[PDB]
């Protein structure tokens, strides 16, 4: 799958729900949870290791980063992953974003920018979505069919990293993975298009 | 994962739909396809590269092996993987199944497994073979009866393994193999 799907998913708005009123794993055989805040409810798929994070019952102090999928599930609007523990305190860390952009087959230009991390525990879904939007706005990502190549690498304070490939949508089973936002050190982006 | 989720999936009945009336990938955005036969329609999920077998549009000459999930999707019953090309010719082969206990004395109890499809999903092989073991070898009959493996061996020694302590993974449910090239099935049970 390529340009058409990418431009389509990444052009959707997201819904950021902090301090959910509910996050309920009705039964162990459900591959998702019911989430709600105020008067809007959703079914959220747990398609990765996140299924182990929310066993049968109610779960308090959670946030949800939703991007409404095309399919209805259990008669509700559906989103995949994007669940995380809510902040125990206000948090905001600015990290460097190094962008390396193709000029031609021989050279590349380096530009620097910043990105703010406002959650203590953040899902890969949310990082991936926000960083690609940032690139759609500032670097013409998905502005043309040729503008789809490269990657985003989130580097942590230790040797760990996480990569988002610009040629494909983040995979469902990775959307529920979370990382410690307080330990994100820098973000490096390689854009392989003029 | 635990005995409870294993027993729950493999104790389900399957619905085998040969010669589907249709299979349809509606938008390229969708993460599965619609299948239907005789006024019943279903939505079938396809993970990873399994979705690439069915580009946007309608596809004929397909079979579906369905195990209904708890979720409804687009108002339809849902299943994961299990799609394959229907037979172009008649085919049937009785494959030896050799069951050995890896605990005590070791000797195998042998039986046969009938293959009738030229192209067969790992979902179907996995599901039918574990069901055969539940019926003949007490698989999942007690919490300690869940260790071992099933190995599907091909004519050229390629093989596919199903570990009995876990449910077949969703990305493998949509994988297909050549039914005509299955040579034998070897099972190891690690419970008494
Ligand atoms: C066809 C396809 O999509 N296959 C999936 C895998 O992607 C494919 O294979 C990998 C190796 C790459 O070549 C992909 O470009 C290729 O499409 C997928 O593997 C995961 O792919 C992503 C990028 O999409 C990434 O490379 C993952 O590697 C890391 C990462 O950089 O993100 C490697 C890091 O060391 C690791 N970090 C830590 C702390 O362990 C992370 C981390 O495990 C994940 O990011 C957490 O979600 O992964 C690579 O695993 C594969 C698994 O998602 O699924 C295939 O279907
Ligand atoms: C934690 C987890 O579930 N990880 C998944 C992998 O399983 C883990 O690692 C493997 C190597 C085993 O040790 C598992 O016990 C362990 O959970 C998973 O790997 C795939 O696991 C299955 C068993 O579940 C199997 O070993 C696969 O290897 C083979 C196979 O024997 O079936 C190796 C064969 O040579 C190969 N055959 C051919 C013709 O290439 C097959 C074949 O590719 C697949 O059967 C087709 O589906 O694979 C092993 O790859 C991994 C990939 O599915 O997912 C991890 O999440
Ligand atoms: Cl529905
Ligand atoms: Cl990715
Ligand atoms: Cl890097
Ligand atoms: Cl397995």
TrEMBL record, chain B:
- Enumerate the UniProt keywords alphabetically: Signal
Q: Which segments constitute the Staphylococcal superantigen-like OB-fold domain?
A: 4-87
- Record domain Staphylococcal/Streptococcal toxin beta-grasp: where: 97-189
This entry carries the following GO cellular component terms, namely: extracellular region
Q: What family does this belong to?
A: Belongs to the staphylococcal/streptococcal toxin family.
- Name-wise, this protein is Superantigen-like protein SSL6
Species name for this entry? Staphylococcus aureus (strain NCTC 8325 / PS 47)
Q: What portion of the full-length protein is represented by this chain?
A: 38 to 231 of 231
